[PDB]
Amino acid sequence: LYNILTEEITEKNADALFAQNFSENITPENFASQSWIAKYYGLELSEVQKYLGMLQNGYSDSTSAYVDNISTGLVVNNESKLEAYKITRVKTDDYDKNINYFDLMYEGNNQFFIRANFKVSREFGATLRKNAGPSGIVGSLSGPLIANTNFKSNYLSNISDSEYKNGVKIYAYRYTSSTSATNQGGGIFTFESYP
Amino acid sequence: RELTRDALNEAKMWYVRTLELLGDEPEDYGSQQWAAPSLSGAASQTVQA
Secondary structure (H helix, E strand, C coil), X not given: CHHHHCCCCCCCCHHHHHHHHCCCCCCHHHHCCXXXXXXXXXXXXXXXXXXXXXXXXXXCCXXXXXXXXXXXXXXXXXXXXXXXXXXXXXXXXXXXXXXXXXXECCCCCCCCECCCCCCCCCCCCEECCCCCCCCCCCEEXXXXXXXXXXXXXXXXXXXXXXXXXXXXXXXXXXXCCCCCCEECCCCECCEEEEC | CCCCHHHXXXXXXXHHHXXXXXXXXXXXXXXXXXXXXXXXXXXXXXXXX
């Protein structure tokens, strides 16, 4: 049991570990049901909700990347598999996201910023260069501000794969008006979307 | 009631039969994702209509 509990789980040996820990009839497709987990482990729905926040079983497609122990199943564009995506970052005075939503996503057509809630951020966000680095308003929130697909709010092009893989691009200026630049927030970022 | 061994076995039989005809009970599922609306949202006569 100690060996089982103290073995690292990575994508390199993910399937091997799954086959070691579960039978041939126990597949991730079967595991994806909360009632299946409850009837397999002899636990209760609220007790397993203590671990898992909310799994989308025909629920809203609101994305909602959040705190450590969240595994989200969702229908995505360029992956024929439900991906549980985990976000953990710390800029100034922020823990999960805070301040509306300042995060990163992988759901859309290409690699860009997040849409945690589908309403566009009222705060005029400017994506500068790397953490605590002034480079001007490169990604200026402007027209279009459209939805029904994960899109860019006037070419947030600074958000790329480099900042997708454990990035440093949560740092962003605040703008009370449309052009009043001031420094509010900056720190480390971590994103991982996994099976 | 009588706590005899055969009586307890018969009660076991009856209770197993009751479980068999009762099946399996379901649990709460709507409380997983039911949102928390405001009083105005709850009393919206337009939504009710």
